[PDB]
Design a protein around this ligand. Sequence first.
Ligand code: SO3
Ligand code: ZN
Length: 256
Amino acid sequence: HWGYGKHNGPEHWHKDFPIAKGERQSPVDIDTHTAKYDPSLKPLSVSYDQATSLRILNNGHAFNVEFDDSQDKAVLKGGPLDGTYRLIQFHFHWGSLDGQGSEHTVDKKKYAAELHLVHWNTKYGDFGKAVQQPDGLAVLGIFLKVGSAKPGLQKVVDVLDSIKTKGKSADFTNFDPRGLLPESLDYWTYPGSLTTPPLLECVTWIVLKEPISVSSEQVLKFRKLNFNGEGEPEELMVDNWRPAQPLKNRQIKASF
Ligand SMILES: O=S([O-])[O-]
Ligand SMILES: [Zn+2]
């Protein structure tokens, strides 16, 4: 099965998912001198006051915080988006070391981790239908740098103990995604895909300029998770990041 090891790593995915070599693959390197300031791009609109977190799950490649997406409770609009995108889940990508973890890179600079807030276009009625469309998904990308602790993240840090191995889930209600957002909403956008199999090219990437800082110890607990199921040989959940893919003439636009 696909994973991040030498035998089932990103360099092998193409065999099972040929799209791996597609035209709008993610992630990419964000070259700051090359991105284009586009003045016709609107401010992002993040309405998360009504978000309904449900549970946290270890799915073997990361941990997903899942939300009730049966109604327009936590949504994203504006920016380069047309229509309403409902928040479904959020997860991270992190490294074995603080000098790596992020998927996206800024001027070839890698951050300690990358937060992904996954949203789906509501005119397609369900997540499953949306991944089949060019504009089915909106993914908010936030970088993590090691510094001071992030208040807002501790609730997550605390439950990781209960979902140590693959297939474990925990109740995780009343969690507010707002405590994960940076002050500024300045962004870069490009059309890309899912960063994990099936790597479908259904994403409008929205990558935030301003990183959020988290402490060493916060980051250390992510690294305690296991890719493996319970009663199996232990394999620490580390470096679950896909390297940068060719931009192939796509244009990266900037809101600033
Ligand atoms: O949401 S991204 O990792 O496919
Ligand atoms: Zn992701």
